[PDB]
Amino acid sequence: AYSNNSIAIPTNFTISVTTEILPVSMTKTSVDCTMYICGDSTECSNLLL
Amino acid sequence: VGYQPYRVVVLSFELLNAPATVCGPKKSTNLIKNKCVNFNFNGLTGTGV
Ligand SMILES: *[C@@H]1O[C@H](CO)[C@@H](O)[C@H](O)[C@H]1NC(C)=O
Ligand SMILES: *[C@@H]1O[C@H](CO)[C@@H](O)[C@H](O)[C@H]1NC(C)=O
Numbered sequence: 736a737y738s739n740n741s742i743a744i745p746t747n748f749t750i751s752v753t754t755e756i757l758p759v760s761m762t763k764t765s766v767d768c769t770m771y772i773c774g775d776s777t778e779c780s781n782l783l784l
Numbered sequence: 785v786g787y788q789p790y791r792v793v794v795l796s797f798e799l800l801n802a803p804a805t806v807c808g809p810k811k812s813t814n815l816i817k818n819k820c821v822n823f824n825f826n827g828l829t830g831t832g833v
Contacts, residue, residue, distance in 0.1 A: 775831040 799827075 773779030804826045820833050 769780055769783060773783050807826075810824075818833065820831065822831050823829065
C-alpha cells in the first residue's frame with residue numbers, strides 16, 4: 736500500500752535462531768599403484784614398469 | 785601329396801569349475817601354508833598366502 740505521505744513503523748519484534756550447514760572436508764584416500772592393477776604378479780608388474 | 789589321406793583329430797576343451805577329469809603329467813608337491821607362495825590348483829595359478 737504505497738503512498739507519498741504514509742509510513743509503517745514496527746511495534747514489536749521476534750528473536751529467531753536459524754541453522755546453516757557447510758561441508759568443510761571430505762575423506763582422504765590412498766591408492767596402491769601396483770596392487771590395484773597387477774596384484775601379486777611379477778610378470779604383470781614387469782609389464783607395468 | 786594333396787590326394788593322400790590325412791587323419792584329423794580335433795579336441796574341444798571345457799575348463800568350468802567342476803572336478804577335473806583330464807590332467808597334465810605334472811607332478812604334485814606337498815602343500816605348505818602360512819607363507820606367500822606360488823600355487824597351482826587344477827591348472828589355476830596365483831600368488832598369495
Ligand atoms: C502526493 O502528495 C500530494 C501533496 O503534496 C497529494 O496532493 C497527492 O494526492 C499525493 N499523491 C497521491 C497519489 O496520493
Ligand atoms: C510482543 O510480543 C510478545 C509475545 O506475544 C507479547 O508478550 C508482548 O506484549 C508484545 N509487545 C507489545 C508491545 O505488543
